[PDB]
Design an enzyme around this catalytic site. Structure first.
Site, PDB file in Angstrom:
ATOM      1  N   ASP A 157      24.460 -67.677  17.844  1.00 28.43           N
ATOM      2  CA  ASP A 157      24.674 -67.128  16.461  1.00 28.43           C
ATOM      3  C   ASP A 157      25.344 -68.384  15.557  1.00 28.43           C
ATOM      4  O   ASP A 157      26.521 -67.817  14.731  1.00 28.43           O
ATOM      5  CB  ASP A 157      25.282 -65.789  16.398  1.00 28.43           C
ATOM      6  N   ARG A 161      28.051 -68.601   8.224  1.00 24.99           N
ATOM      7  CA  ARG A 161      28.606 -67.392   7.875  1.00 24.99           C
ATOM      8  C   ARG A 161      29.291 -66.760   9.171  1.00 24.99           C
ATOM      9  O   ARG A 161      30.173 -65.827   8.910  1.00 24.99           O
ATOM     10  CB  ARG A 161      27.372 -65.868   7.774  1.00 24.99           C
ATOM     11  N   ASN A 162      29.514 -67.336  10.262  1.00 23.26           N
ATOM     12  CA  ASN A 162      30.111 -67.329  11.259  1.00 23.26           C
ATOM     13  C   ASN A 162      30.880 -68.432  11.817  1.00 23.26           C
ATOM     14  O   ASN A 162      32.148 -68.317  12.883  1.00 23.26           O
ATOM     15  CB  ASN A 162      29.195 -67.043  12.665  1.00 23.26           C
ATOM     16  N   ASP A 175      32.566 -65.029  16.103  1.00 20.45           N
ATOM     17  CA  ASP A 175      31.582 -63.920  16.175  1.00 20.45           C
ATOM     18  C   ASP A 175      30.644 -64.247  17.490  1.00 20.45           C
ATOM     19  O   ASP A 175      29.713 -64.787  17.345  1.00 20.45           O
ATOM     20  CB  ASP A 175      30.729 -63.911  14.881  1.00 20.45           C
TER      21      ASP A 175
END
Ligand SMILES: Nc1ncc(-c2ccc(C(=O)N3CCC[C@@H]3CN3CCCC3)cc2)nc1NCc1c(Cl)cccc1Cl
Length: 290
Positions: A157, A161-162, A175
């Site tokens: 992932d 955004r992470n 995350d």
């Protein structure tokens, strides 16, 4: 059988050294949420050898969660506890496993996620980020991935955004909801919603993940960083057309603020053959010199 075997950390019992009393913990505002649960800000009192009062982040499932999902949070906890610490990872500080639902406590990174950070700067400038800063974020994420790769931990992932920004604006990969431990394929069980625009073709078409799959994702992130947080494949929806483009070798165009050398690194991360992509360690060598 053979007396030597690789040790699967998901098979290890919970290590009690991470245990922290939940009554040394005070919950604050929600940082992020979903259907699985949420991550809240909390104050921890007397945690580790750290500051006596310490702002931390805590992950928990909503009380609705089933056996499936509780077990997925324990697996996450177990993976994170075997890694050890690194400067460019959102490290695990402890957990709460007795007297209530599972809580996973991790470093609080005060400036939030990289994506939103980049977008605020882009919006502010329209109304000041320099190439050096973008390079530093890239290099720091690369360093964290190299550490994860060296543990045979595939994150799955990797996206702006992470990535989170802590004190001094230091980047850290966070995350670990989809993180998995291998060794040498990881096969997708199925039906989890997945981050398709960050996924390597072999992951989409063959359900196969290696560490070189993360490298593909990292290339996409590079595209996000050097475009100041544009959504990948801007204007192109996930459908038959998208999958064809990806399979036939389509690549995003050079973003506005990416020097040629960085775009070239991007393009090499987007090789269709995973073994033709560079390793995270090689990428660390490239960005240490830029
Ligand atoms: N471990 C963490 N540390 C901090 C944060 C964190 C802290 C603040 C903000 C934020 O949204 N801030 C910080 C400046 C601007 C913005 C302003 N907020 C104030 C009110 C609404 C938005 C966002 C994340 N989150 C963490 N873990 C959860 C998480 C991960 Cl591991 C990955 C991706 C997303 C998330 Cl949420």
């Amino acid at each position: 059988g053979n007396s030597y075997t690789f040790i699967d950390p998901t098979q290890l019992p919970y290590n009690e050294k991470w245990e922290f009393p939940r009554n040394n913990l005070q919950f604050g505002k929600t940082l992020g949420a979903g259907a699985f649960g949420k991550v809240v800000e909390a104050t921890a009192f007397g945690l580790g050898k750290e500051d006596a009062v310490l702002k931390v982040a805590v992950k928990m499932l909503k009380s609705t969660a089933h056996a499936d999902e509780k077990e997925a949070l324990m697996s996450e906890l177990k993976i994170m506890s075997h890694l050890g610490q690194h400067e460019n990872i959102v490290n695990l500080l402890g957990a709460c496993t007795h007297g209530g639902p599972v809580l996973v406590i991790t470093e609080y990174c005060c400036y939030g996620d990289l994506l939103n950070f980049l977008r605020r700067k882009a919006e502010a400038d329209l109304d000041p980020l320099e190439l050096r800063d973008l390079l530093h974020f890239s290099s720091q994420v690369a360093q964290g991935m190299a550490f994860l790769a060296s543990k045979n931990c595939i994150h799955r992932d990797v996206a702006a955004r992470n990535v989170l920004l802590t004190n001094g604006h230091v980047a850290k990969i966070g995350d670990f909801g989809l993180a998995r431990d291998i060794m040498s394929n990881y096969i997708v069980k199925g039906n989890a919603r997945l981050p398709v625009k960050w996924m390597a073709p072999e992951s989409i078409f063959d359900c196969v993940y290696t560490v070189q799959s993360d490298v593909w994702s990292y290339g996409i992130l590079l595209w996000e960083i050097f475009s100041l947080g544009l959504n990948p494949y801007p204007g192109i929806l996930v459908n038959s057309k998208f999958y064809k483009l990806v399979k036939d070798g389509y690549q995003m165009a050079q973003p506005a603020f990416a020097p040629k050398n960085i775009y070239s690194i991007m393009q090499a991360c987007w090789a269709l053959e995973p073994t033709h992509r560079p390793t995270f360690q090689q990428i660390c060598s490239f960005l240490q010199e830029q």
